[PDB]
């Protein structure tokens, strides 16, 4: 039985990679320092390999994303950078002030740099791929370069600001990038490269025949190579298609989906060829019954195995989690654990090894028998609307912002050795402002999800369980191992102190179900939905005792409402069923209370009918960006009559825009729907502002709204 393993995570059991990009970009060490930092973490990934399975790959050590390597590498440089210069340049492209576009890898919390082609002409411009493959070479071991496909790469890839996707639109590009992979494998082959790990995840979205079509020809062009092919996070739709691809040796990811298993039950797998089979999640942090998996396996024929996704989607270690709940640690089992169940996996299918391991009912039956009268508020919007508008008595073109507040040095400070000093003076401040609706700052917060996994049962968080998501970014997700019930009242003391300071509503401020399950781990024995349901229940515990509390505005925090859907279209009614579901669990408020759902991705054009029976009564967009624009989905919405609060203000920038640029976001959205339906707010919280940036912004949205009333 052969053992593959890839994406192991590059940040190493202390963040070194983390340390040396910063220590780097601050310029405490040298490139050559900063050279070998790397080194020693390229080691470091080997070493775990090479104790674990059998192919080693290499290239995996990228210094910011592989995205942006695989165009380094085919010479998808845009003009505004000029020459390549090398890692001053390559970091400029990241990180720099006009760096690429920075988006989420197909359904996951990893973010890539999206390569934007100005040419049609690719060309080898570096081989990264030889570099590793001969530095590991040169130390006497044999690697497996692990690359992206060039139908992927160009299903990332953006030309004239928008997708490459279309079949027509690939068709000429494919056939100028093959060329380039072509000089890298042969340079690879004319180097004693056995294997090249080949990385096709797009195989597994919403694709049309004329698409395979070109992915036949693309891999008839490289059929002379000892390529191996990798899909995973969803299942790939054309199998026959797939299998039949010129590749001696093709994998598949057979846990995040039951249709692989079902293709391959029905229309069986080529003996031309090897299935490799993903059977060890890379997603989540379970121990799995390796007896089960041994017989998966053998019932899939495979000669071969592999974690089913990438390892990078998990933290390095659970060696030094000593502070877990009960029992907790020994189910879990983070990327080198993964490493080790392979490896067992392996020994047990080839009888090596005999010995494996074996692996609240109140709040269970309260989801389980849910009233089916739970999922909708007591009254309708309509009349909702006319006594929450009686209620609050709110000018036209109300100001609000959306919660979170900029951090000075003592506020992070304190937090990580009060609170009311500087709830007190935000509210002070926003009064002095002139703001309509008012906020607490969310200064107590580390982040919108950490705050509230800390405070739910069933939900643990782990002292070094660090993830990358993007650069030198990490965080730690919560891991939800048990049924999620919320014990004691969360945010009271601070919304409570909050309100009796002023007479203006100041809003209750809490994170959706959808998110917390987003960028947390969770049980794989349970179905989706009733975890959503627990969460869901949990948080509608806090609005209660929100609005008891005499909290006259919720808000609801789901920015991850469509992130979490899955990458095939096909399986989209499902997942909202559950997603609005669990939403409207949450949001099931007293019908004088005004909820706010808070949604700040970029568009909701494919979903506006799923965002229709959410129970909320104003929605908060992010409209700078698009200067208005992606109000579209929304006035195009016959029936639609909810509030929006329209994003006038990008608060990624430390620019303070000007009257007249939030202005045209305003005018652009009353282009259509009445001006009783708007209220003005910044794109998203201002944590990551400055407050000399934020005060006049916010003086300039009062002002606007004035002049618009
Ligand atoms: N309430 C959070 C939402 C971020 S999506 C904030 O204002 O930071
Ligand atoms: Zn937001």
């Not at 082609?117 to 001969?134: M, Q, R, S, V």
Request: net charge negative; proline share 5%.
């Amino acid at each position: 039985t052969k053992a593959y393993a890839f994406g192991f995570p590059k940040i190493g059991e202390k963040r070194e990679f983390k340390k040396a990009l910063e220590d780097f970009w601050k310029g405490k060490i040298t490139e050559e320092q900063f050279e070998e930092e790397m080194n020693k973490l390229r080691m470091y990934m080997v070493e775990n390999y090479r104790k674990n399975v059998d192919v080693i790959p290499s290239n995996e050590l990228s210094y910011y994303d592989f995205v942006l390597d695989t165009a380094v590498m085919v010479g998808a440089v845009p003009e505004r950078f000029g020459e390549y210069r090398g890692l001053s340049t390559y970091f400029d492209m990241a990180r720099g002030g006009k760096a690429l576009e920075m988006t989420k890898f197909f359904n996951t919390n990893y973010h890539y740099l999206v390569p934007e082609i100005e040419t049609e002409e690719f060309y080898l411009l570096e081989n990264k791929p030889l570099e590793d493959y001969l530095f590991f070479k040169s130390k006497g071991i044999e690697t497996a370069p692990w690359v992206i496909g060039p139908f992927t790469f160009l299903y990332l890839s953006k030309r004239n600001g928008e997708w490459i996707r279309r079949p027509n639109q690939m068709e000429k590009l494919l056939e100028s990038l093959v060329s380039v992979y072509k000089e890298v494998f042969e340079k690879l082959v004319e180097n004693g490269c056995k294997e090249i790990l080949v990385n096709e995840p797009a195989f597994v979205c919403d694709l049309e025949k004329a698409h395979w079509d070109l992915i036949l020809n693309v891999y008839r062009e490289l059929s002379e190579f000892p390529l191996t092919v990798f899909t995973y996070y969803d299942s790939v739709s054309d199998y026959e298609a797939c299998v039949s691809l010129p590749v001696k040796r093709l994998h598949f990811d057979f846990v995040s989906n039951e249709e692989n298993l079902k293709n391959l039950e029905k229309h069986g797998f080529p003996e031309d060829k090897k299935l490799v089979a993903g059977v060890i999640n890379g997603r989540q942090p379970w121990k799995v019954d390796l007896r089960k998996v041994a017989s998966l396996v053998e019932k899939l024929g495979a000669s071969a195995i592999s974690n089913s996704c990438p390892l990078f989607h998990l933290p390095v270690t659970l060696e030094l989690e000593n502070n877990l709940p009960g029992g907790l640690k020994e189910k879990l089992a983070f990327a080198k654990e993964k490493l080790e169940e392979l490896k067992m996996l392996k020994d047990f299918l080839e009888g090596k090894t005999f010995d494996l391991p074996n692996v609240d009912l109140q709040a269970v039956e309260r989801v389980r028998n849910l009233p089916e009268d739970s999922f909708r508020r007591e009254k309708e919007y309509t009349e909702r609307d006319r006594i929450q508008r009686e209620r609050l008595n709110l000018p036209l073109f109300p100001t609000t912002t959306i919660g979170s507040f900029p951090q000075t040095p003592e506020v992070r400070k304190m937090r990580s050795k009060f609170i009311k000093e500087q709830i007190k003076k935000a509210i002070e401040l926003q009064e002095e402002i002139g703001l309509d609706v008012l906020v607490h700052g969310e200064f107590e917060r580390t982040d919108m999800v950490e705050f509230f996994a800390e405070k739910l049962n069933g939900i643990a968080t782990t002292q070094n369980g660090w993830v990358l998501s993007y650069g030198s970014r990490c965080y730690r997700p919560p891991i939800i191992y048990g049924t999620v019930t919320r014990p004691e009242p969360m945010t009271l003391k601070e919304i409570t102190y909050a309100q009796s300071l002023t007479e203006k509503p100041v809003k209750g401020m809490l994170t959706g179900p959808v998110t917390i399950m987003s960028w947390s781990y969770y049980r794989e024995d349970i179905p989706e939905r009733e975890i959503a349901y627990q969460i869901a229940l949990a948080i509608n515990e806090e609005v209660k005792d929100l609005e008891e509390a005499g909290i006259k505005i919720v808000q609801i925090d789901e920015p991850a409402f469509r992130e979490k859907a899955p990458i095939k279209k096909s399986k989209w009614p499902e997942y909202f069923e559950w997603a609005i579901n669990a939403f409207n669990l949450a949001a099931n408020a007293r019908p004088e209370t005004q909820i706010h759902a808070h949604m700040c991705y970029s568009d909701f054009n494919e979903i506006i009918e799923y965002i229709h029976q959410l129970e909320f009564d104003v929605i908060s967009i992010e409209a700078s960006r698009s200067k208005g624009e992606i109000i579209s989905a929304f006035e195009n919405f016959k029936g639609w009559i909810k509030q929006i609060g329209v994003g006038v203000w990008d608060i990624h920038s430390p620019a303070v825009p000007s009257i007249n640029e939030m202005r045209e976001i305003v005018e652009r959205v009353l282009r259509v729907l009445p001006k009783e339906l708007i209220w003005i707010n910044p794109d998203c919280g201002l944590k990551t502002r400055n407050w000399d940036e934020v005060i006049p912004s916010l003086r300039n949205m009062v002002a606007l709204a004035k002049e618009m009333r």
